[PDB]
Point group: C3
Chain length 662, copies 3
Amino acid sequence: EQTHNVVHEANGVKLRETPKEFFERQPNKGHIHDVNQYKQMYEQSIKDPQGFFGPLAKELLSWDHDFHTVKSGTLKNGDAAWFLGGELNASYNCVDRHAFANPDKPALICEADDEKDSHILTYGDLLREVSKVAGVLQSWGIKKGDTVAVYLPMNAQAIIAMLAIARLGAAHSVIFAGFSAGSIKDRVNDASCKALITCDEGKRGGRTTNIKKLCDEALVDCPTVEKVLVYKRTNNPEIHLTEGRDYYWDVETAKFPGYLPPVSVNSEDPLFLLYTSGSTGTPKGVVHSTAGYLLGAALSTKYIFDIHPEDILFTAGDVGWITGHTYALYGPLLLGVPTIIFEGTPAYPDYGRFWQIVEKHKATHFYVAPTALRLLRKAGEQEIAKYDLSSLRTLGSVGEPISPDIWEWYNEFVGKNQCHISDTYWQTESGSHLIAPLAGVVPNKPGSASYPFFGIDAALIDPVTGVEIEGNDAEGVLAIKDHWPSMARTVYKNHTKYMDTYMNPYPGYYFTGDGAARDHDGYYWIRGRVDDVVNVSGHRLSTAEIEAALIEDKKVSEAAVVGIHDDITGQAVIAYVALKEDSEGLRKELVLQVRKTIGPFAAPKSVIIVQDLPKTRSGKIMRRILRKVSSNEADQLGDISTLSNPQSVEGIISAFGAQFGK
Amino acid sequence: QTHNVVHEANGVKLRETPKEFFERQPNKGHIHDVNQYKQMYEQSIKDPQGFFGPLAKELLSWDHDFHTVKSGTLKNGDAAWFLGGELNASYNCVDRHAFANPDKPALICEADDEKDSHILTYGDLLREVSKVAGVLQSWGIKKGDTVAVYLPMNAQAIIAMLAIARLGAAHSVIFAGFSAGSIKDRVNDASCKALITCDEGKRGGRTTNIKKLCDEALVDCPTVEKVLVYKRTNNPEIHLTEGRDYYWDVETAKFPGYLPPVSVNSEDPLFLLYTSTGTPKGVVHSTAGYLLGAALSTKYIFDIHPEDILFTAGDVGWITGHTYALYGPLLLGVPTIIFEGTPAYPDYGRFWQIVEKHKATHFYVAPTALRLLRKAGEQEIAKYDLSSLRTLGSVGEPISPDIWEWYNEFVGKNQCHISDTYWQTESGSHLIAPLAGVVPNKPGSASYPFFGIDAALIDPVTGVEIEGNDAEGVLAIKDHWPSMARTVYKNHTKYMDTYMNPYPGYYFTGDGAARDHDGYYWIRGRVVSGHRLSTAEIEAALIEDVVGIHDDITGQAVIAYGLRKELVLQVRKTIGPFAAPKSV
Amino acid sequence: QTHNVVHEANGVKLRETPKEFFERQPNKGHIHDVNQYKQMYEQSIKDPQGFFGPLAKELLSWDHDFHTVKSGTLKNGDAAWFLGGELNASYNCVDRHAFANPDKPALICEADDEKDSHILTYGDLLREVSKVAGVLQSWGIKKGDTVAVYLPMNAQAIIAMLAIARLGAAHSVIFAGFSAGSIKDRVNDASCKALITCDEGKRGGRTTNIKKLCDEALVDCPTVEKVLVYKRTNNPEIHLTEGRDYYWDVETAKFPGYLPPVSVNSEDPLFLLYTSGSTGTPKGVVHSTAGYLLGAALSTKYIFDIHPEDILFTAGDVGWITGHTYALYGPLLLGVPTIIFEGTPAYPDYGRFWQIVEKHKATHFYVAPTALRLLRKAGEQEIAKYDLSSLRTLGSVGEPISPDIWEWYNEFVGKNQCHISDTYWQTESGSHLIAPLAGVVPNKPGSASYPFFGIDAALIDPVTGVEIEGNDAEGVLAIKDHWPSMARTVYKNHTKYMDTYMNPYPGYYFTGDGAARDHDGYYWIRGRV
Ligand SMILES: C#CCOP(=O)(O)OC[C@H]1O[C@@H](n2cnc3c(N)ncnc32)[C@H](O)[C@@H]1O
Ligand SMILES: C#CCOP(=O)(O)OC[C@H]1O[C@@H](n2cnc3c(N)ncnc32)[C@H](O)[C@@H]1O
Ligand SMILES: C#CCOP(=O)(O)OC[C@H]1O[C@@H](n2cnc3c(N)ncnc32)[C@H](O)[C@@H]1O
Ligand SMILES: [Cl-]
Ligand SMILES: [Cl-]
C-alpha cells in the first residue's frame, strides 16, 4: 500500500537520494554497485553465511592460522562462534600490517583539548609505541587471558594502551574517564584486572581533571591490581605515585624496544570487556570475541560509511563507549586509514571546533551523536560558515534517534545538501552496525535507519503473543533471528545473566531491548528501548543503579528513578525520593551523591521529594505510575485501587508539578 | 594339522562369521577378506610411514601437520609418532562431529536407576565440555597441568575428561571405588592442581560416599587448589570446604557453551592412568598416537560404521573405558552407551534391556560379567530383542571355550561375530584380536596381531625369538606402535626396567602365549647380565636352610633379605652359579 | 697504488688460497670466485628481502611461515627479521639431523684429560637434550623464562643451552671463571628461575671450585628456585642444598628420550649474554632466534666453507660469543660434528690441539691469536709430531692478528697449504662482520678484508660525524643498516642499547672500533676508540 496504518513516521515521506556530489568526491569506484547488488549480497549473508563471510574474512583480515568452519552455534543455546580454528592478532591487523606496507602513512590524527598540543602518529610510530607498552606489560607478567583496565581520556595513549593489551592476547577493559571512583572499583574488581593504565591529570574544555586521584581512591579496594602505568599528561609533579605499584609510562617504555612479537589468539578468544548498564543495578561486562568483532568493524566501516584507503574518518566519540571502540579505533585502523582522536569538547575553544578539525585534516567522513547536533544547532550555527567542509561526503549519526528536523539541519548546514547521511542503529552488544543506510547506495528517509546490514536478519515480535510478525506496516519488539560475527559472546563470568537478558526472553531470537516499526518499503524505524533503559546524551544508564546511589544517602528511605523526554539530552532522569524522618539543599546533596557514586553524567535532571512511593499489595514500587506522571499523562493511570497506598498517587502528581521547575 | 606344543588348538574347527553379521552390516565392510588384511598388515610392519601416515590424516583432524610419522626405538625408550604435528583430543571427539550433525547422539547415559537416564547429542556434549573447560580455565588450569577425576561411569566423568583435554592438560581418572589412601597416592604422584568429583554415587540402588572419601584424601594433597563437585544426589548434608570446593552446576552456569580447544603436540601427554605388591605407577599416553590407535582398532576390529552404536560395559576408571567407551567411538562419531550401574540392578536383565532399548550393534564386556549373568540371569537374556547386535567383544582376561560358546549362543544366538581382544593399559589399544567379519575364530584364541603390532614369542631363558609355529613362550613385540605408552610419570626408569630392558629390543607384555600352525596366538597369562633369575626360586632355596632392583652395570640386581656365604653357595648349587643374589 | 693513510697496506702482496685447499675440499665450493661473491654481496645490501628470504628457507626449518623479511631501522632500534615466523633452535640444531642420520657425530668431546673423552651422535644428543628439558619442564620452566648456565666447555654446557632453548626459554651462559659477585650480578639482572652447573671442574689437570662459587652467589639470588648439578668429578663432599639442588643424572633418569620442542617467534629472545662495556655494570646483550641462527649458519657456511663432511674445531668457550656462534649453533645448524674441548692448549703438553686435530681429522680450526702467541713461545716443536693434513681453513678471532702471527699461523699450522680467515665481529653482531671467505677472498696479512653479506660497512669522521667517501681512509667503523644476527636490545635497558650503538651516529651502528679502508676496499681494524 501507499498509506501506512501503523508506521505513522513514514506517511508522506519523500526518499532522499544520495546527492551527486557524493560520487564526484568518491576516490574510487564504490564498494557496492547499486541497491540491487546490496540486496543480493544481503540475501546471501542470511541464506549462506559460510559462502558470504568466509571470503570476506580472508580479504579484510590477516590470519596466523586458517579457520575450518565459518559459523557455529545458535542463539537459543548461547554458543555462537565464528571462524573456528582460526588464529590472528588484533594489533597486527590494526598496526603492523599497515606499518610494513607504508610506515609513514598517518594513523592517529590526535587533536588535543587545546590545539597547540595536537600531533599526528604514523603507523610506524604507532607500532613502536604499542610494542614498547606491550613490552612493559609483558615484563609485568601480563599474558594471554589476563584483563587490563584502562582509565584514560580520548587521546593517543588510550588507543595505544588498548592495542598493546590486545598485542599480548589479553583483553582490555576501558573505563570511561567520566566515571567516579566507585564505578572504577566495581569494573576492576569484577574483571580482576592485574594492571591499570591511566594518567596523572586530564584536559577537558581547557580545565584540568583529576584522573590519577580517582584511581588511587578506587584502588584502595582493588587487590588484584598489581601495577599501574601512569602517563604524564600534565606532568604535574604534585601528583603522587604509590611506591611499588605506580610507574611512569615514559620511564618504563624507555626500557623496551620498538618491536614486540604479537601473540596469536583464537578467533573466539576474548578481545575486550566493555561494561554496560542494563536493567539490573550492577553493570555487566559485555565480552567480545576477536575475529568476529574485528570483521564486523572492518565490514561495516567499509560498506556503510564507504571508506577507501584515501579517506579520513572523524568519529567524534570516546573509547569509553562502544562507538569509540569500533569506529574510532578498530574499524578505521583495520582498513588502514587515518582516524581522528579528539580529546576535547565541541565547545572548546568555541563551537566551531569540530569543523576546524574537519577542515584542518580534510576529513572525508564524520560520525557524531544527535545530542551534539542539537547543541551546535542551538549555540554554534554561526560558526559553520567560517570553515571549508567540502572534503566531507559521509555524515553518520549514532547512539540515539535522530529527529527529522535534526536530520535536515545536519544535511544542510554540515553537508550542504551534498553528503550522504548514515543513521546507524546498533548497540554495545552487537559490536557493529545492525541497521543503516549504506553510503551511496541506500536512499534515505529522515529518521529511519533503513535496511538491516549483512548477516543481520531483523524481525518484529508481537509483545502480546511473542510471535514474529509477518508483513510490513508493523510494530513490535525488535529481535534478530540468527547470531552474527560481531555479536557479543557472554557477560564476563556471568553467562547466565547473558542468557536471561538477550536469548531467553524471545527463544530463538536475539532481544535488542528496543522496539521498532517496519514500513511498506522494509525500512525500519527505531522507537526506543522497551526495557526502561535510559539513554542520556548518548550514555546508557541504569535507573536501578541511580536508585541505589540515591538510597546510599542515609537520609533517603526509598528511591524510584524513571526517564522522560528532554529537548537537549534526548532523555532525562527524574528521581523520586522518600525520606524517613533542607529543600533544594537536600536535592543538591543527592545530585552530588549520584555524581560521586556513578559519575557526573548520570546525575538526575530533577529530584522530586515525596511522602512515599506507590506500592503494590506485595510492598513493591509501581514504577509505571511514576513514568505516566512524569510524562504529564496523569490521566491514563487507570484503576489504582490495586495499590496498597493509592492515596500516595495524588501526592506524587502534585510534587512533580511543584518541584520539576524549581 | 596336529600340535605337540599348542594343545589348546588341537581339534578346534574354525568358526566362520555368521551370515547374519553381514546382513546386519550397515555398509560394505572395511576389509574384504583375510587376504586383504594380510596385505595391509604386512605394510603396517614393513612400511609404517606409508601405512600410518595416510590413516592419521584420514581419521584425525590436525591443527599443525606432522613432518615424521615414526621416530625412536624400544631400546632407547624414545618412541614418538607424527612429530611436529599439533591437534586437540576434544576437537576430534566432539567439535568436528557437532559441526557436522549437532543432533546426532553422542553419550547414551544409562543411570544406576533408569529414571535418571538421558541422552546427550554431540551439540550438547560440546556445550557441556566447553563450560567445564571454562571453569577450569578461569581457575588457571593450562597445558602441562594434571587434573584428577574421581567419578562413577556416567556423563560427568566423560565430560570432565574431555574438558581437561580441551585445555591441553592431562586428566588422571581414579576409579570411584578406590579408598582414600588410593586417591591420596595417585593425586600426589601426579601433583594435580584440581579435582573433579561428586557428592555421592548410586550403584545397585545403594548410596556411595564419594565426596567424603575425597575430603579424607585431600587433607594430605597440598597441590589440589580447587575441587568441582557435581550434585549427583543433591544430599544437603554433604560438606563443601569454603574456598576450595565449588559446585559443578553453579560454576558451569557462569560460562558459555563454546570455548576454543587448545592445540597440543602429537607427543604431549593426553592422560595418566595409574595401575593397581607394586606401588601405583602412572602410565602415560601420548595424544596423537593413542587417538589413532583408538579410532583404528575401534573401526577395523569391531567393524564400526557411522550408523552403529557401541555399548562398552566398562568403567572409565580403567583403560577399557578410556579407549572403547570414550575415545574410540567418539573419534569415529558414533554414539557410545555409558552405563552407571551394575548388571544386576534393578534386575539381571539390565544389559539386555539396554541393548534392546537403544538398538546397540556392538557389545563389549569382560568374561567376569558373563560368568555372573550365566550364573544368575541366564533366563533373562531371551526376554529381550538383541537382533541389532552383530559384534560381541571380550576383554581383560582369557575367555574359556566354554564361556565363548555360551556368549556366542545365548547372547549372539549363533548370529554374531566374537572378538576376543587381547591388550594392556600400556598398549593403549588392541594388540591381538579377530577383526569382525574378517578373521575366523578359534574359541579361546585372540588370533592375529593387529596393524603395527609385530608379535613374537621369546624363549624366556635366552631372550631369543622363537621361529616357527606350534610354539610357546614369552609374548613380546618387536617395534613400538602409535598408541604405545610413552613413560611412567616422572619415573621413566621404572618404565624402561619393566617393558624395554628385560628383553632388549622388544616390548615385554608380561604375558606368555602360544602360536599354533595357523599363526593364531593363545594367551597363557602372566609369567642379571643376560641371565634370567626367578625371585621365587631364590626364596625357596634360601628357605630350605628376594627382590629385584635396577643396576647401572649388570642391568638388574637381586637382593636377598659366615652364614651369608653359606646361603650364597646354597643358591648356586640349587639353582645355578649365575643365580646367586648380589648380596644377602 | 700507494697509500697515504692506510700505512698497513703499502707493499703487502695478496696471498691467494693454496692449491691444497681446493684439493682437500669435499665438494664444489659455495662461491666460485671473488666476483660472484660481490654480486651476492651487492644483492644482500640492495635487496635484503630477495637475498635473505630464500636463504632463511634454505638453511632453517620453520614451524610457521614468515610474512616480512626485514623491518625497522637503526635509528629507531626496532630492527626485526622474518616477522610472523616460528621455529625452534634445538630442532634445527639437533632433531632434524637425528631423524636424517642419528648415528652421525654431533659433539666430539675432548675432556680436560683425554681418558674421559667421548662422542655424542645427533641421536644421542637429542635424547640427552630431551631429558634435561623434561627436567626443566617439570620444574615450571616455560617460554619466556631465563635459565642460567655456569659450566666449563664440555658436552653438558652444550646440552644445557639446547635444552633451555627447546622449551622456548633464554639461556644466560656465565663463563665458569667468573666470581660469585659476577654470577650474582648476572643472575639477578636476568631474574633466572633455574641454574645449571656442576660440582667441580677439570682445568689443566687441576680441580676447580664450581658449585662452591654458585652457592656463594645464590645466597643473593632469590629468583633461582632450583639448581641442576652435574657430577663432573663426583666428589661426595660437595654440599647440595636440600629442596633446591638436584643431580643431573638423578633427574634425567626420570624422563623420556624425546620431548616436543616449543615453537618461538622469530623475534623471541634466544639467549642473553652479558658483556662488559665502557659504562659501569655488565649489560645483558639479547639476541633474536631467527636472525641470530641464520647469521650463525650463513657465516659458518660461507666464511669457513663448511660442508657436511667437514669437522669444525672452535677452540673457544661458550662463556663468550665465539663459543655460542661457532662452537655450538653454527656447526650444529649445518649438521656437521663440532669439537668441544674442555682443557687447555698446554695440558698435558702443547701438542693437545694438534693431537685432537689429528685424532678426529678436523678440517677447520678456529682460535684466538692469544693462543697462537702462547704456542709460538712454548709449543712450536710439538706441531711437527702430529698430522695436520686434514685442515684447510684456519680461523682467527677476537683480536687483531699481527702479520707476524699470521705468517707463523700460516706456515707451521697450515703448512702454507690452508686458507686463513681473520674474522672481525662482536658479541653484539652475533656473527661475522668482516672476514676473508675461504677459497674466495685473497688475504692481506692483518686485514679482515671485505664485509660479509648484509653488512654495509662505512667509515665516519669522528670529528664531523660524516661518512667518509672514497678509499685510503681512516675513522670510526660503522654499519649503515641492521643485519639478521644483530643484537636487538640490552635486557630491560633498551636505552643503554640506543645510547651505546644507535645514537652516537644516528642512522648507523657504532662498532666502538676504529678502522681503515685501503684502495682495494680491504678493511684494517685499528682497535677500540
Ligand atoms: C550505538 C550505540 C550506543 O550503544 P549503547 O550505549 O549500548 O546504546 C544502544 C542503544 O542506543 C539506541 N540507539 C543507538 N543508535 C540508535 C539509532 N541510530 N537510532 C535510534 N536509537 C539508537 C538504542 O536504544 C540502542 O539499543
Ligand atoms: C585389556 C585390558 C586391561 O588391561 P590391564 O588392566 O593392564 O590388564 C591387562 C592384562 O589382562 C590380561 N588380558 C587382557 N586381555 C586378555 C585376553 N583377551 N585374553 C587373555 N588375557 C587377557 C593379560 O594378562 C594382560 O596383560
Ligand atoms: C669476535 C669477538 C669477541 O667479541 P667481544 O668480546 O665483544 O669483543 C669484540 C671486539 O674484539 C676486537 N676484535 C674482534 N675480532 C677482531 C679481529 N678479527 N681483528 C681485530 N680486532 C678484533 C674488536 O675490538 C671487537 O669490537
Ligand atoms: Cl614398585
Ligand atoms: Cl660371591
